[PDB]
Amino acid sequence: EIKELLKLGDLPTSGQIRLYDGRTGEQFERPVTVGYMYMLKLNHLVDDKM
Amino acid sequence: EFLKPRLVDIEQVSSTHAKVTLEPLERGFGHTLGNALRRILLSSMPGCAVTEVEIDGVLHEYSTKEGVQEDILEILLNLKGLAVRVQGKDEVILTLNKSGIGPVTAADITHDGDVEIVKPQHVICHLTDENASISMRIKVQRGRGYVPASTRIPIGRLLVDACYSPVERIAYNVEAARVEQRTDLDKLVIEMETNGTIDPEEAIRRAATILAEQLEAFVDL
Amino acid sequence: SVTEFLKPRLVDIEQVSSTHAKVTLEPLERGFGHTLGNALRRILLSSMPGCAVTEVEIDGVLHEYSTKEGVQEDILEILLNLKGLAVRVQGKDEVILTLNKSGIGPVTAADITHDGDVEIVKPQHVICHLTDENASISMRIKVQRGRGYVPASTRRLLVDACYSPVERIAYNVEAARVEQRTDLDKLVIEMETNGTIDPEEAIRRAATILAEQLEAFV
Amino acid sequence: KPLVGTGMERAVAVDSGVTAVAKRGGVVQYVDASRIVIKVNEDEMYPGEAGIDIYNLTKYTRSNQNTCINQMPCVSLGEPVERGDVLADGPSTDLGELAL
Amino acid sequence: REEAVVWDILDEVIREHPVLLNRAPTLHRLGIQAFEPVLIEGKAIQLHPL
Amino acid sequence: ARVTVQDAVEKIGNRFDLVLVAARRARQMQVGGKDPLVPEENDKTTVIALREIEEGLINNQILDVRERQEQQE
Amino acid sequence: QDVVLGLYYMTRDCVNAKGEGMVLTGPKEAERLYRSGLASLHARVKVRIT
C-alpha cells in the first residue's frame, strides 16, 4: 500500500529519484532516496558546553 | 568561431515565476552557462527586505498585545515574509494603522509613491476587540544575502532577520533547437521563481554582468 | 554597497616546469570559487581549438590487428605514440605529412618531412624502434583542426583527435580570511599542457571565450 | 504535525495537562492572545448563576529545564466548541496533536 | 574588543604551536595526541577523520 | 614549516636526546643572540632549531664545543 | 567506512559500459575522459602505464 499510495501521485514507485550535484551540475550515476523524515533537536547545545 | 547567445522569449506564466529561453548554443555550453547562471541567481541578488519594527504598546518581542489574535513573536515571523519593492531611495520607513474587528492585510499600509506591494493579500494578524488599535512603523532596507540580527550589531525597537534574496528556486534544462541544418545547436531554458519583487530579464542581465565582471580578472592575467 | 564584490588581489603563479603550472587566487565571495573553477574546467576540456592527427595510412599494414616485421612495437603501440604528437598548424585546416625511415634506430618526431606551416614542438618524440637493417617504414599522417576531444568510435586507420591543448585540470577551494570574515573562498587551480602553448596563457584564452559568450547581456 | 505518526498523539497530548480543554461546550465569544472566553450552551449550564467560563493562558513561563512554556489559541471568534475539545495548543502541540 | 590587529597577531602566534587532544576515558596511550591548530569559525572543534 | 622529524631522529641516536639538544639550541636562539645558521621563513624558534639537526650540522658534540669557546673570555 | 566504499566503487569492472574497449595514452588522459562524460567510470580498456 506504500507503493499504491505513491502511485496516487506522479512519483516513482521505487521511491528513488535522480539528483544533480549542486557544485558541478553532473547527474549522479545511481538514483538515490529522497523523502520526508521527522527530526528532533536534542537538548545538547554547544554554547552550553564549550 | 562560436555563436553568440541572446534572449529570445520571456514567457510569463504568473505574477511570480517565468521562463526564459536562450539562443542556440555550441554543444557543451548548455550545461556550462546553465549551472553558473543558476548558482549566481540563487546566491547573490539585490533585495528589498524588512529589518526593524516598532509597535507603540510593546516593550519586547516576547510580550503580547490586547486585542490581537496571536503573539508579537508570531507577528514578527509573519512580517519577515513581506514582499515589497522600492525605486528611488535605498531605505524607507513604512507606517501601518488599522482598527476594528477584521484581518490586517498589507494593503492597509500607507502607499506613498516609492514603495509598491506585490502581494496585497498577505495577512499580518487579526483583531478581535471591537475597539482596538494597532500601529507600527516598518523599516525596509535594500541589501544582498542573509544578515542575521545578532551579527549586524532604544527599548521600543525590535530587530528582524533579513532574507534579502528574491529568488527561492531555479531550474534549467537543455534541449536541441531546430535551427538551420546544424544538429549540434541547442537552446537553454531557465524556469525561475520569485516572490514577485524582481523582473526576470533584469535578473539574467545582472547575473551575466556579475559573471563577466568576475572573469575580467582571468582575462587580465 | 549592493553591487560591488571582492575582486581577487593576490594572483600567485608557481611554475613546476615549462608545461606544469599552479595558479592561486584569493579572496573570492562565498561560493564563487566553485563556479569559476567549474566553468574553466568545462570550457577547457572540450572547447579549446587545436590541431591534431586524425587518420594514418601505412603501406605495410592494412588491418588494426597486424604485425610489422623488424618492429617489436605493434600497430596499436604505433597509434598510441602518434596520439601524443604535438603539432601546431598556422592557417590550414587539413595537412598531410609523409614520413619515411629505414635502417636501425628509434624513429624520432624530427624525421618527419614538414613544410614551413607545420611545426613539431617535441622533435625527440619517439614513434617506434627499428631493429633490422633491412627494415624500412613509411606512412602518411593527416592533421586536422578541431575542438575538444573526438573518439574514434563516433567516427587507413582512424586515430583519436586530441584537439584541446590542455591535458589535465584539477581545482580546489580553501578558506581564506579577510579581517573578521572567514567564509571567503580561495581558488587553487592546477593545469598541465602538452606543450603547444604556455600553461597560464591557455587560461586567458579560456576566460576570453566565456566573456565572449556574455556580450549580449552585459 | 508529524507526517508519519502512530495515531495516539491526540491521546498523549490531551491526557497531559499542557493544553486547555473545554470544561463545558458552547460558542466562543472573545478570543485573545492570552485569554479565552466560552459561553456555555443552554443544556449544559447550571440552573443558577450560569454565566460563562474563562481560561487564562500561561505565556512564557520558565520550565524546570530553562525552556519556554507557551500557549497559543487555536480557535477563531464565533465558532462552536464541544466538551473535551482542544482550545489552546501548549508547547510542542498542534491542534491537540503531539508534535515534538 | 576583538580588534582587527588582535586576529592578525593571534594568527601569527599560533603558526606552529602544537596543542594536545584527549578524550576521557584515555584507554591506551593513543588517547592523547598532538596537533597543529588552524583557526575556524563556529563553536565546535574540528577533527581529522582518519 | 615542518611536519615530521623522522629524518632528524635518524640523524641522532634516539628521540629523547634529540628533544634535549633541540630544546637547548632553541633556548640559545631565543633568549639572546645566536643568529641561526639556516635562513628563516618566519617560523618559531623551536622548529628552526630542529631543522639544523637534520642538516647534520648541530648535535650534542658540535653544540658543546662552541659554548666552551664562548665562555673562555 | 565512507572512504572504503568510494575506493571499492572506483575499482570494479562492468561487462559493458560507455566507452569500453578503447586504448588510452596514460592516466592523465584517462581522467580527461571521465570528467567529459565520454566514458564510464568503470569499463575495461587498455592503458599505457609506468
UniProtKB/Swiss-Prot annotation, chain A:
Biotechnology: Co-administration of salinamide and rifampicin or salinamide and myxopyronin suppresses the emergence of resistance to both antibiotics.
Residue positions, PTM N6-acetyllysine: 7
Mod. after translation: Acetylated on several lysine residues in the presence of glucose.
Oligomer and partners: The RNAP catalytic core consists of 2 alpha, 1 beta, 1 beta' and 1 omega subunit. When a sigma factor is associated with the core the holoenzyme is formed, which can initiate transcription. The rRNA transcription and antitermination complex (rrnTAC) consists of RNAP, NusA, NusB, NusE (rpsJ), NusG, SubB, ribosomal protein S4, DNA and precursor rRNA; S4 is more flexible than other subunits. In pull-down experiments interacts with CedA. (Microbial infection) Interacts (via flap domain) with Escherichia phage lambda antitermination protein Q; this interaction renders bacterial RNAP resistant to transcription pausing and allows it to read through termination signals.
Functional summary from the UniProt entry: DNA-dependent RNA polymerase (RNAP) catalyzes the transcription of DNA into RNA using the four ribonucleoside triphosphates as substrates. Resistance to the antibiotics salinamide A, salinamide B, rifampicin, streptolydigin, CBR703, myxopyronin, and lipiarmycin can result from mutations in this protein.
UniProt similarity note: Belongs to the RNA polymerase beta chain family.
Span covered, complete protein: 1194 to 1243 of 1342
Curated annotation (Swiss-Prot), chain B:
Protein name (record): DNA-directed RNA polymerase subunit alpha
Covered residues, full protein: 7 to 234 of 329
Known outcome of mutating residue 39 to C: In rpoA112; temperature-sensitive, blocks RNA polymerase assembly
Reaction(s) catalysed by this chain's protein: RNA(n) + a ribonucleoside 5'-triphosphate = RNA(n+1) + diphosphate
Species whose genome carries this gene: Escherichia coli (strain K12)
GO cellular component, one term: membrane
Stretches the record annotates as Alpha N-terminal domain (alpha-NTD): 1-221
Domain text: The N-terminal domain is essential for RNAP assembly and basal transcription, whereas the C-terminal domain is involved in interaction with transcriptional regulators (such as CRP) and with upstream promoter elements.
Domain of life where this protein originates: Bacteria
Curated annotation (Swiss-Prot), chain F:
GO biological-process terms attached to the record: bacterial-type flagellum assembly; bacterial-type flagellum-dependent cell motility; cell motility; cellular response to cell envelope stress; DNA-templated transcription initiation; intracellular iron ion homeostasis; nitrate assimilation; protein-containing complex assembly
GO (cellular component) term, any one: RNA polymerase complex
GO molecular function: bacterial-type RNA polymerase core enzyme binding; DNA binding; DNA-directed RNA polymerase activity
Main enzyme class: transferase
EC number: 2.7.7.6
Catalytic reaction annotation: RNA(n) + a ribonucleoside 5'-triphosphate = RNA(n+1) + diphosphate
Keywords: DNA-directed RNA polymerase, Nucleotidyltransferase, Transcription, Transferase
Stated family: Belongs to the RNA polymerase subunit omega family.
Binding partners and assembly: The RNAP catalytic core consists of 2 alpha, 1 beta, 1 beta' and 1 omega subunit. When a sigma factor is associated with the core the holoenzyme is formed, which can initiate transcription. The rRNA transcription and antitermination complex (rrnTAC) consists of RNAP, NusA, NusB, NusE (rpsJ), NusG, SubB, ribosomal protein S4, DNA and precursor rRNA; S4 is more flexible than other subunits.
Function, in words: Promotes RNA polymerase (RNAP) assembly. Latches the N- and C-terminal regions of the beta' subunit thereby facilitating its interaction with the beta and alpha subunits.
UniProt name for this protein: DNA-directed RNA polymerase subunit omega
Organism: Escherichia coli (strain K12)
Curated annotation (Swiss-Prot), chain G:
Organism the protein comes from: Escherichia coli O157:H7
Protein name per the record: DNA-directed RNA polymerase subunit beta'
Subunit-structure text: The RNAP catalytic core consists of 2 alpha, 1 beta, 1 beta' and 1 omega subunit. When a sigma factor is associated with the core the holoenzyme is formed, which can initiate transcription.
Highest rank taxon of the organism: Bacteria
Task of the protein: DNA-dependent RNA polymerase catalyzes the transcription of DNA into RNA using the four ribonucleoside triphosphates as substrates.
Similarity section: Belongs to the RNA polymerase beta' chain family.
